[PDB]
Design an enzyme around this catalytic site. Structure first.
Site, PDB file in Angstrom:
ATOM      1  CB  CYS A  65       0.417  -0.205   2.994  1.00 11.74           C
ATOM      2  SG  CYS A  65      -0.987  -0.889   2.082  1.00 11.74           S
TER       3      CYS A  65
HETATM    4 NA    NA Z   1       0.131  -3.126   0.900  1.00  9.28          NA
END
Ligand code: NA
Length: 108
Positions: A65
């Site tokens: 992410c």
């Molecule tokens: Na993140």
């Protein structure tokens, strides 16, 4: 197993080069198109169904992410769906581009 593990980008890149695991990037589409690891699959709520039909629960999956934080919740979620081997990449895309600048791709 019933827990996921946090790994660093050097470890993730080795699992990838060895074809041992798949890499999924759960960032938003714009961020993904601005630059992502070569070979990452863009995994979102909308692509989840397809991902699961295409990757059995026994496939090691590494989740990337923004910085290594949201990949934790997403990894735990994948465990809950039935994936047995799941990893969260510490440092996120930022660490990946830093360590492996030549291995970034653009667009979808
Ligand atoms: Na993140």
């Amino acid at each position: 197993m019933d827990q996921f593990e946090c790994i660093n980008v050097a470890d993730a890149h080795q699992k990838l080069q060895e074809k041992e695991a798949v890499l999924v990037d759960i960032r938003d589409p714009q961020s993904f198109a601005m630059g992502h690891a070569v070979q990452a699959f863009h995994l979102t709520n909308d692509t989840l169904g397809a991902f699961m039909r295409d990757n059995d629960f026994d496939t090691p999956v590494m989740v990337m992410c923004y910085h290594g934080n949201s990949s934790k919740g997403a990894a735990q979620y994948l465990l809950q769906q039935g994936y047995d081997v799941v990893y969260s990449i510490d440092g996120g895309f930022e660490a990946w581009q830093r360590q492996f600048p030549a291995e970034v791709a653009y667009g979808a």
